[PDB]
Amino acid sequence: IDTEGGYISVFYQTRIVVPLSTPREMDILGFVSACNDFSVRLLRDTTHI
């Protein structure tokens, strides 16, 4: 809950240069997951209606 945690940014370092009519519209996907060191404690369900 709420307040820090850091950030992750992505900067164009250089333009994304391309050969022929290839479109100037690429895309990027982002993933996230826990590593072995991750763990949780004190369960707390909240789901209701």
């Binding site: 370092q13 250089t14 333009r15 240069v17 391309v18 022929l20």
Partner: protein, 234 residues
């Protein structure tokens, strides 16, 4: 295959540093024996690949140039060290890649020039900091001259590497510290100076990025500074 070089908080990917050239085949190192020689040694965070703002090479691009250490007169730490300290001396690995598509013919010459006195005079004029200075084909020192009324064709004497696009797309000069002294004021005296000139003019196919980017990744190596440390006695 791609090597991923690291220097603490910074990391650069490099295709293959097989074509790495160390100027005068002298690897940069510290001051050899030849504490009493006041070798304040902060080879920690000032030795990380920095990255200058990329220039955009185009058809009619004449050329670019950066003085070193100058360039890094702001790249965080190192730039700091060049103020809390009176004296210093660093080598440098300069790493120039310029990613382009297989459909861009072209070729650049990267020239490391010791004591690169660019002629045609006022400190600021000859120290373009981090954005570097550009040439012109007729302020801007004449390109095929490098300021100094020399014929381009001879540049190749100075530690150099050619980025011929239809082959390697990267280049890595490794300058060692060079100077008439053994240490010096890193601020008011630019040991080196990197000039990048286009040999073959940049040309490409119809509808393709008409301005390929070229980045410089200057990492100061085995750097050191003067001393403030005095001495007491009972």
């Amino acid at each position: 295959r791609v090597l991923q070089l690291t220097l603490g908080n910074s990391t650069i990917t490099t295709q293959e540093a097989a074509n790495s050239v160390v100027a005068y085949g002298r690897w940069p190192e510290y001051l050899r024996d030849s504490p009493v020689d006041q070798p304040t040694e902060p080879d920690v965070a000032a030795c990380r690949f920095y990255t200058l703002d990329t220039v955009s090479w185009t058809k009619e691009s004449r050329g670019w140039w950066w003085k070193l250490p100058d360039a890094l007169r702001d790249m965080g730490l190192f730039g700091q060290n060049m103020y809390y300290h009176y004296l210093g001396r660093s080598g440098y690995t300069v790493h120039v890649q310029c990613n382009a598509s297989k459909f861009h013919q072209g070729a650049l010459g990267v020239f490391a020039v010791p004591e690169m006195c660019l002629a045609g005079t006022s400190y600021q004029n000859a120290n373009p900091g981090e954005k570097g200075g550009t040439f012109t084909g007729t302020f801007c020192p004449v390109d095929y001259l490098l300021g100094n009324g020399t014929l381009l064709g001879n540049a190749f004497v100075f530690p150099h590497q050619i980025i011929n696009l239809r082959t390697n797309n990267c280049a890595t000069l490794v300058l060692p510290y060079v100077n008439s002294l053994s240490i010096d004021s890193m601020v008011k005296h630019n040991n080196w100076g990197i000039a990048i000139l286009p040999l073959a003019p940049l040309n490409f196919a119809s509808e393709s990025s008409p301005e390929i980017p070229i980045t410089l990744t200057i990492a100061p190596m085995c750097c050191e500074f003067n001393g403030l440390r005095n001495i007491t006695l009972p």
